[PDB]
Amino acid sequence: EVSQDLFNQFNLFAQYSAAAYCGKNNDAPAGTNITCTGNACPEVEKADATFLYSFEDSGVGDVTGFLALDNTNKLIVLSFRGSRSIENWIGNLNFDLKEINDICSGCRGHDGFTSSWRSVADTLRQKVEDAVREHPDYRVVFTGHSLGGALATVAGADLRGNGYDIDVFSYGAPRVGNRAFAEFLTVQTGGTLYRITHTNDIVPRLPPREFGYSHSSPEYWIKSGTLVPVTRNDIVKIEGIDATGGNNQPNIPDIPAHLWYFGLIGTCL
Amino acid sequence: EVSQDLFNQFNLFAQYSAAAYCGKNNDAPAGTNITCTGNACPEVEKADATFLYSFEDSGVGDVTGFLALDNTNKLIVLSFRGSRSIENWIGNLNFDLKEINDICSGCRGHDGFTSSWRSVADTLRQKVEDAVREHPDYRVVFTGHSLGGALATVAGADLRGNGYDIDVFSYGAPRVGNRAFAEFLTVQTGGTLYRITHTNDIVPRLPPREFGYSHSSPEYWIKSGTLVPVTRNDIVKIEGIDATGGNNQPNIPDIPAHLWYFGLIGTCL
Ligand SMILES: *[C@@H]1O[C@H](CO)[C@@H](O)[C@H](O)[C@H]1NC(C)=O
Ligand SMILES: *[C@@H]1O[C@H](CO)[C@@H](O)[C@H](O)[C@H]1NC(C)=O
Ligand SMILES: [Mg+2]
Ligand SMILES: [Mg+2]
């Protein structure tokens, strides 16, 4: 029974996430208005929102995304793009873990996702801190769909505790590491993670539990269909690390369900 | 206005049109159930609907689509697919008109669309007539999106007046010929043409009028945006050969608006 207010924020960061794929320019000047093709982010376009910094193929893991200033919603938004070819990304996904003791003790995380974040963290923390110091009453939100949602979760876990709260809104994010990391992500203070999933989306089911992966609690499960508008009654809050009955159900998953989080996402008309 | 009953046919033939692209099965042997990926054609899935015949790269013009038997709605549906690559197809669209005296006197048609149809006409007329002879109380409906909307319109014009009505439902169809042809399609007896357009979709604006092309009347104009659900009152019936104030407006057109007719069409999640 999610609040009307939190539902409206789920929609907004779904569109910031979507905007990471469908942004008008990929070399866009800082200060230029955020717009999308194909009506992928109308709520963002309604806002007084601008690009503070745009990154494409950035650092080791070819990280793509933007830092946005929203003067209407009073947000600093760091949005990470998922893969440009999601089916190929899924098939090629490695299940290798790595120590991430610098984020939390005994925590391990997907090699790729944690590597990629580490390679751009210094730059993006600096950009985020300039924004905080220029706009101290502005709320920091990190967001991402798919791979982008993994990056956003890792970055949030990493940069929390340094003076600014960081909310994270992840959309069809894969598992990011082991049970220790899931437990950290579940109780870490200095912001809330809203880990959002849809029906039988394949990506939150990877990498598999059998390779040493766990999901953080809680889960915000969208049970309304692919290409169906989402009502507030359509979101189910599921508590427990590796809880089942949401997206973690013993049935055949689906790629199309990955591309529909409140609206079209991870692809551009 | 349009009745709720007509709004439901528009939504059903939009999904029969969508299925020409997202047809879950290309194996697709006669008698197999119609299903789509990505929730593209749920109303078709609900119906007892089967492939009577399926064609790919058919004839000179490489016509693709299927002939369906629907025992729930009692339909014989010929569904033509538009292009695999609509943006490429829009850019390479040649405006050459061909004499089509054979279908109506003084009529000229798009050389491509009319040549394409003529090359599969004998084979496909025999398949509909076979289907009509076994199910004479069934309604014959030709439908398609984009290039598919044009093929259906030409097929309709050509095969009508042979003992069965042919209703045509086109989605974002281009202009198919000159004013003589547009007039023939406005008054032809032996079924109705439902020519449906969306906001500022580019495709119903091609080929241009200044290449001697005209639209048949009427036009059913969807005013609701891209990725927005369509309500009955969002559809405006616009009367008049080459009427303006629907899709035929002197503003900047849009490709994404081509891919949203009631839902996702001409593309498959
Ligand atoms: C950018 O957005 C601002 C605030 O939303 C608006 O007032 C201005 O007209 C926009 N600039 C451009 C280039 O459209
Ligand atoms: C096809 O649909 C029919 C009628 O709705 C049904 O009897 C049958 O179970 C379906 N076939 C398959 C392969 O699902
Ligand atoms: Mg704006
Ligand atoms: Mg016409």
Numbering used by the authors:
A (entry chain B), B (entry chain A): 1 to 269
Q: What did the published study say regarding this structure?
A:
First, lipases are very versatile enzymes that catalyze the hydrolysis of ester linkages, primarily in neutral lipids such as triglycerides, which have been extensively characterized and used as CLECs in many studies and from different sources representing an excellent example of a biocatalyst and its applications. Finally, we determined the three-dimensional (3D) models of this commercial lipase crystallized with and without phosphate at 2.0 and 1.7 Å resolutions, respectively. The structural model presents the closed state of the lid (residue 86–92), as present in many other structural models, which does not prevent the enzymatic activity in the crystals form as shown next.
Initial hits were obtained by the capillary counterdiffusion technique using 0.82 M K/NaH2PO4, 0.1 M Hepes, pH 7.5 (C23 of the CSK screening kit) or 5.0 M sodium formate in 100 mM AcNa pH 7.0 as precipitating agents. Protein and precipitant concentrations were optimized using the batch method while keeping the agarose concentration at 0.1% (w/v). Therefore, the final optimized batch experiments consisted of 500 mL of a protein solution (final concentration of BioL 15 mg·mL–1) in 0.1 M K/NaH2PO4, 0.1 M Tris pH 7.0, and 0.2% (w/v) agarose. Using this condition, we obtained crystals of size ranging from 8 to 20 μm, with 8 ± 2.52 μm being the most abundant at almost 50% of the sample. Although BioL was crystallized in its closed-lid form, the enzyme was active in water and organic media.
